[PDB]
Give the backbone structure.
Amino acid sequence: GSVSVALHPLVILNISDHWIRMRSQEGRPVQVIGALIGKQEGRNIEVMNSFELLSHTVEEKIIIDKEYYYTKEEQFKQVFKELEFLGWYTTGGPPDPSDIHVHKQVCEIIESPLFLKLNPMTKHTDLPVSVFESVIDIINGEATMLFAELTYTLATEEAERIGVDHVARMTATGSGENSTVAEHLIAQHSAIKMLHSRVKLILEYVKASEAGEVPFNHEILREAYALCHCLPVLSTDKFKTDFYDQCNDVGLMAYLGTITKTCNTMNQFVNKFNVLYDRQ
Amino acid sequence: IEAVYTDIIQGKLDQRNQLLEVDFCIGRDIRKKDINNIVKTLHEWCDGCEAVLLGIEQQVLRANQYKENHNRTQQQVEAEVTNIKKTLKA
Amino acid sequence: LVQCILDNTIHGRIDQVNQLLELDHQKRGGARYTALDKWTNQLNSLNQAVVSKLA
Amino acid sequence: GLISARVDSHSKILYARDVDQRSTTFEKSLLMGKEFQRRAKAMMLRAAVLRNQIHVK
Amino acid sequence: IIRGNQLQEFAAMLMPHQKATTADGSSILDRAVIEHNLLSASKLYNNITFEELGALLEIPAAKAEKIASQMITEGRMNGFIDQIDGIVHFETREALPTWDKQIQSLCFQVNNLLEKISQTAPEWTAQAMEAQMA
Amino acid sequence: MLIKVKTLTGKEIEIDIEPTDKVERIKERVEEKEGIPPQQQRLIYSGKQMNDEKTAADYKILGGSVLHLVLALRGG
Amino acid sequence: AQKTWELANNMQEAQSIDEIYKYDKKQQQEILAAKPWTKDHHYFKYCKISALALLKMVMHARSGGNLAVMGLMLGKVDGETMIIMDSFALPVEGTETRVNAQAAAYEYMAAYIENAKQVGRLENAIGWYHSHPGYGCWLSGINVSTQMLNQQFQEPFVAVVIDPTRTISAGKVNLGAFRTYPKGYKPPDTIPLNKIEDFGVHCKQYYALEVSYFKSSLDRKLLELLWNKYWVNTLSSSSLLTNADYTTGQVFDLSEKLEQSEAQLGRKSEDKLAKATRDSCKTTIEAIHGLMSQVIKDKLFNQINI
């Protein structure tokens, strides 16, 4: 698949933050345009960082000014010494013609630019990030340029992996009107929905093998049988006793604290009552 | 123990309770009369996940409604007290 | 054994009837229960103060 | 006193009794809840008898 | 677990100073293999009596206990010995932690099975994912 | 002049000064006015640190002048 | 899901999670004009660091290896909370125990902020951060001096100290946000020994804010959809056992706070009972959340196939 591209879980966060910021600033979702930074070694391209870019819009056309890009390049060259321009990125659905004009514009800066594309409006269970690459055709008459998809890895370093694990593990993120239940049960709901999607696909494959659409794969069905045989996970009596212990412990911890809230309300009511029905 | 070495099954023996606690076992051969049982077990699991998902949504909606009800009552009392306060302030 | 136990050198107890020595492979993370005991005691005293504030 | 034991008068053996930490906390916490609710109800009635200004004259 | 019948061809190639008995009837070779057998037997058992422990290691009841207590107190194996009923407890799982471990293994099997589905018939998997909306 | 300076935290100062004022008298004026230590001050004009051994002649400025004030930083 | 979950997500409109990402200029001007931090001194107690800012700071700290690194952090304030929305590196050169930022950092600061204002970054600098490679997260003497200098003139300012070595060797990020007291002001009055052991000599000269992190909805979705090890670790997270000790410590200092509230209410003006009740409600809510997770897991896995 032409070159091999490795992605870091920091470009994704940068693009998501930029999209969220623009959406919150202008009220409505809006296409964002940035730039990719990384290291190229022969056939191995690695994307390590990104920074936002400034673009102007005349009629129905987007022009990226080069003065700001060059100043920002001089800026980032002082910190990331051995890091170079690789491509750009955008948010949206499938590639659009405007993406091809912007790619043509970027081609004047670098000979072989990449093209990342995030899809925040996706409605499926695969990563919205898709990496493309320019291809020049020899079509008779007018000459056009096309996008060829790419297969990308998700290489991370030690500190980046630690940070991503820490960020994705914690779930105490809620703030505002919504209850904390509405911030924890939603994470539980998403995890259960992913598991449900996987199990539904497995069941669909098993039924298709039963009917005849797909060839009879003995090993896959054997592994499905093994998966089904493990479904009643740890239904022993000791587990039930431990579960009941945990439930009773949480019940007692809730009781001590419901008592505290009631005592606080009692103090509040007594204080409000004293100044009104004072006997002096 | 020899069966564990071939890795067909995994587990730990228990002499005091006279039990063999199996943690993992391979899936034996299948025939065209247990595939329907595979579908039945997996379909029941899918309905189990759907029931849990529906329950989570209902509890989230109920908790949010309780939060809105308490906030509305809290602001309703504060609105009433200020009205009677402003009236006598010249 | 008696001298060692009284000196806190050996963590165990002697079963004189059966001539046994039961060691102390115990004292797990049971600090949660003691924390709850302090919570209950403070709530017991705090509750009395609130009722008996004025009358 | 400081001795925590139970005398067995059949075989004349002094067994040592160890309290169960988990059950002790549950017994005390539930007892505190029962006492607290009784105090709350009594105070609630006291508020009624104070607002109504009831006394023996 | 190494039995005493596959080591006869190993004791012949040992250097002469390594075949020195320790004044108890047992050579150096069938003392390290005894400790290795005991350490490996703690990975297949939750608890084992002295008589049964002395059935696969020889050393019937009096030396297996001595060696078992000798491996402990030196940071070589985890466990404790109940001498009254004659049983050695190696490692006991706490039920609830086992439940989460088995859940993780169950989810691993779900992912691995779907990986083979998308690896064997990729054209069918793509059709199935799109049909999942409807 | 219409000299307009800002800190990095969004603060704002506006001073009406005469174009060719010697920086020492300006330092004394800020000393008696606010009291920021001059040796812990850095002035930035158009992404360049103001060189001390150079007068404000080649800096042709007329209206809407932007100055950035930065305090010294140190770590470890 | 129909009507129930249709408005529950509403991707067209920012959720309650993405509320913090909106910059209100008028509110910022009002709070900076009021200057509520001048009257009190333990005003700011919470520091909310965004996910991207924390990731960038951690990666920068680790990139230096055993040499110190430093940079700035943009953000805003809200009530008693200091929110950090981004961070950006400085082109400085330092040794294992000293970073100076002599002459290239001060131009880079202004130029980078000017460049960022062009592409829609409405936040201003809120703090400075530097790394302590292998000797904990604390404020040294010169760190305290520069923190005082920054705080006295640029009033909202928090110093963040990272430790890349302990972060790598422990598996969890080691970070700390601190603020300092005015010069010669507020000398308030086993604790001192450990306090000087883990902090510097100026233990009473500065205090430590409570650090919390947040993330947007798109960030949450992308992270949870990145690897398969994030929903597997949710269905087997097993709370109430990973952090039981933290719960017991919270119960302990809850008991101490309840004792203090009982002492206060029997007879400066803070209403300690309300704060104790809030803390109790919080910890009980985490406990019940853990129990709900366990119940959901039991209903999902154990109650299938008889």
Remarks:
- Chain G touches chain C through 14 residues (CB under 8 Å).
